[PDB]
């Protein structure tokens, strides 16, 4: 899963 958050 490609980082989202930021």
């Amino acid at each position: 899963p490609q980082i989202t958050l930021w």
Partner: single-chain antibody, 232 residues
Framework: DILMTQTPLYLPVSLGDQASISCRSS???????????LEWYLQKPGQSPQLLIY???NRFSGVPDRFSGSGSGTDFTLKISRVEAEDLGIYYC?????????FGGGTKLEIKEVQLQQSGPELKKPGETVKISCKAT????????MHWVKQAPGGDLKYVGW????????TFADDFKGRFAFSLDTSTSTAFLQINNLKNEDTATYFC?????????????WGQGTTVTVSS
């Protein structure tokens, strides 16, 4: 942006004592999703950080209950009920709640299947170029992203940025916009970091890191790191 201040700089104990390390953040660190990404790392000489506590009070797999995290607001504390020999090293607190993620200055506790392979050390002269490599193994390279943390000669940790392993799209923290570039070879499941027009300030160990955010953990897998020595 968000400054993480640790207390104390040094912590001398005797095998068996209780240890407490605090960390204050210049701002609230509650990600908009309702999660507070405060995390505690233990780093031993020559190695890379080891995620211990994440989401303030959560112990990472393998971490013994002698370790416990607490706090709220801006002050956070890491407690070690009884210090053991293997606990010796530098403890770093860190927040991944707001970009760019940031690390505390570290506290040196002292006495009175997934793997990432990084290329070897580089000795360069100011002005040259370097392309450090990081080969991901035992996980779908394109599933997660690849992060890059810089560790200065002093020990300081800085987020360089990350790259979408699916879109080949990089994102950098402001202090790495300019001369840093991310790339990849999904063919060989490898992430690259290239620094152009090197400067003494670039001398540091760079680690590629893999997160596990869907699990709430940030930076759970680190490469051994690569040392770039920019000597004049």
């Amino acid at each position: 942006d968000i400054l993480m201040t640790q207390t104390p700089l040094y912590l001398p104990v005797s095998l068996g004592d209780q240890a407490s390390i605090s960390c204050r953040s210049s701002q609230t660190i509650v990600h908009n999703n309702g999660n507070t990404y405060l995390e505690w790392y233990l780093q031993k000489p020559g190695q890379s950080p080891q995620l211990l506590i994440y989401k303030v009070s959560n112990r990472f797999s393998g971490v013994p209950d002698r370790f416990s995290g607490s706090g709220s607001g801006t002050d956070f504390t890491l407690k070690i009920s009884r210090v053991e020999a293997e606990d010796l090293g530098i403890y770093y607190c860190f927040q991944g709640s707001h970009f760019p993620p940031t690390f505390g200055g570290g506290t040196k506790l002292e006495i009175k299947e997934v793997q990432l392979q990084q290329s070897g050390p580089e000795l360069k002269k100011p002005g040259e170029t370097v392309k450090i490599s990081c080969k991901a193994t035992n996980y779908a390279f394109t599933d997660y992203s690849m992060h890059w943390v810089k560790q200065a000669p002093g020990g300081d940790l800085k987020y360089v940025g990350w790259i979408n392993t699916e879109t080949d799209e990089p994102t950098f923290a402001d202090d790495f916009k300019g001369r840093f570039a991310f790339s990849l070879d999904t063919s060989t499941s490898t992430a690259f970091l290239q620094i152009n027009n090197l400067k003494n300030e670039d001398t540091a160990t760079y680690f590629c890191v893999r997160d596990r955010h869907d699990y709430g953990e940030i930076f759970t897998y680190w490469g051994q790191g690569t040392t770039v020595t920019v000597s004049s």
